[PDB]
Write an enzyme that holds these catalytic residues in place. Structure first.
Site, PDB file in Angstrom:
ATOM      1  N   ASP B  25     -35.362  22.051 -16.897  1.00  0.00           N
ATOM      2  CA  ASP B  25     -34.391  21.006 -16.558  1.00  0.00           C
ATOM      3  C   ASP B  25     -33.780  20.411 -17.829  1.00  0.00           C
ATOM      4  O   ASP B  25     -34.342  19.497 -18.444  1.00  0.00           O
ATOM      5  CB  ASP B  25     -35.080  19.913 -15.735  1.00  0.00           C
ATOM      6  N   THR B  26     -32.627  20.940 -18.225  1.00  0.00           N
ATOM      7  CA  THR B  26     -31.957  20.494 -19.442  1.00  0.00           C
ATOM      8  C   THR B  26     -31.402  19.085 -19.304  1.00  0.00           C
ATOM      9  O   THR B  26     -31.015  18.455 -20.300  1.00  0.00           O
ATOM     10  CB  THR B  26     -30.808  21.449 -19.840  1.00  0.00           C
ATOM     11  N   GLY B  27     -31.328  18.577 -18.080  1.00  0.00           N
ATOM     12  CA  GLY B  27     -30.865  17.193 -17.859  1.00  0.00           C
ATOM     13  C   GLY B  27     -31.965  16.146 -17.821  1.00  0.00           C
ATOM     14  O   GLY B  27     -31.724  14.989 -17.477  1.00  0.00           O
TER      15      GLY B  27
END
Ligand SMILES: O=C(O)c1ccc2c(CN3CCOCC3)c[nH]c2c1
Lengths: 6, 99, 99
Positions: B25-27
């Site tokens: 999850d890059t966010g």
């Protein structure tokens, strides 16, 4: 759906 | 590996003799699981998302393997609808976004 | 571009003729942007996150340019604290995760 984290 | 995004990027993670799965999850600034095997005393933490702010349980220096890459850092326990591996652990395994 | 994850992967977008920045979020199924006007008609949608659900307006077949790569697809608009480019448009620009 979902949007994920501050 | 090289992971395309046509579905959720769920990976095998191992923690405390349990294989679970979680979304790369890059966010997410943080790594957040819904529940984790009995790992100790935790500290209070607040985090936020698009719907508002939630209380979570912070556990530090957790040993975790992600696709059999070893990493170490803070794992939060909280009301996330999917387990998520945040940037705190993504940087340790050398994960980048590329286009 | 290759984007490391030591900070939030915020990139320049162009949408509705306006330059904005937004967060490359592999943990976001869909794209959600702050309140703005877009062309066409919208339809009400609910999106889940940390903190709960939010009510959004869904515009289809919107053109957006992310670091110079044009993509067409669904954009949700509503009260997010951050602009977020989700997998539905990250696949359109050929964005992958690499480690
Ligand atoms: O922009 C608005 O004014 C608006 C108003 C109402 C809704 C709703 C209500 N629904 C959507 C479908 O599932 C359950 C609830 C969603 N987005 C919305 C946006």
């Amino acid at each position: 759906x979902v949007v994920x984290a501050x | 590996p090289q992971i395309t995004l046509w579905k959720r990027p769920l990976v095998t993670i191992k923690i405390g003799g349990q294989l679970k799965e979680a979304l790369l999850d890059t966010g997410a600034d943080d790594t957040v699981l819904e529940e984790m095997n009995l790992p100790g005393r935790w500290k209070p933490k607040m985090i936020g998302g698009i719907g508002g702010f939630i209380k979570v349980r912070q556990y530090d220096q957790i040993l975790i393997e992600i696709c059999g890459h070893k990493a170490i850092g803070t794992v939060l326990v909280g009301p996330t609808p999917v387990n998520i591996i945040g940037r705190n652990l993504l940087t340790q395994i050398g994960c980048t976004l590329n286009f």
